[PDB]
């Protein structure tokens, strides 16, 4: 048993809820929250800007030191950093950004990072401002992630679109 509440069960291991990922992290304090990161860990908008804002910019300060030491992530890659006040850890995962022209086939590689963690609170990757189709992102998630994933999909309209169409 875990602390996640109000989720619809899609599969053996994938759950979904109409909830903002920041408010969910603050309530649950999960072991792992996933950030929808870019390769530079520049948290400006979407999930990254909201999580960083909720950490009072401590996520960005930590991320800038990570990049200064290690250089940029790969598209499809990840790193584990602090979860600050939101979670034990933040798994920063880079899905392909369609609005920058990246290979959508890299979305499966992105989701494979989740399999290194037994339980995660996560957005969809590559949807919203990243330019891909969220229905596709949910299908790749279900067909790639084997660990237990709780998908916090921001508002009613995106929640309603994903559930009704789910195969
Ligand atoms: C940044 C990209 C991946 O956004 C996807 C949509 N998204 C989702 S799925 N859950 C949230 O909680 C959330 N907050 C802001 C955006 C957002």
Swiss-Prot record:
It is a multi-pass membrane protein. Coiled coil: none annotated. It catalyses: Thiol-dependent hydrolysis of ester, thioester, amide, peptide and isopeptide bonds formed by the C-terminal Gly of ubiquitin (a 76-residue protein attached to proteins as an intracellular targeting signal). Residues 1-167 form the Macro domain. It is found in: Host endoplasmic reticulum membrane. Inhibited in vitro by GRL-0617. May form homohexamers. Interacts with N protein. Responsible for the cleavages located at the N-terminus of the replicase polyprotein. Participates together with nsp4 in the assembly of virally-induced cytoplasmic double-membrane vesicles necessary for viral replication. Antagonizes innate immune induction of type I interferon by blocking the phosphorylation, dimerization and subsequent nuclear translocation of host IRF3. Also prevents host NF-kappa-B signaling. In addition, PL-PRO possesses a deubiquitinating/deISGylating activity and processes both 'Lys-48'- and 'Lys-63'-linked polyubiquitin chains from cellular substrates. This is Papain-like protease nsp3. It comes from Severe acute respiratory syndrome coronavirus 2. The chain holds residues 1025 to 1191 of 7096 of the full protein.
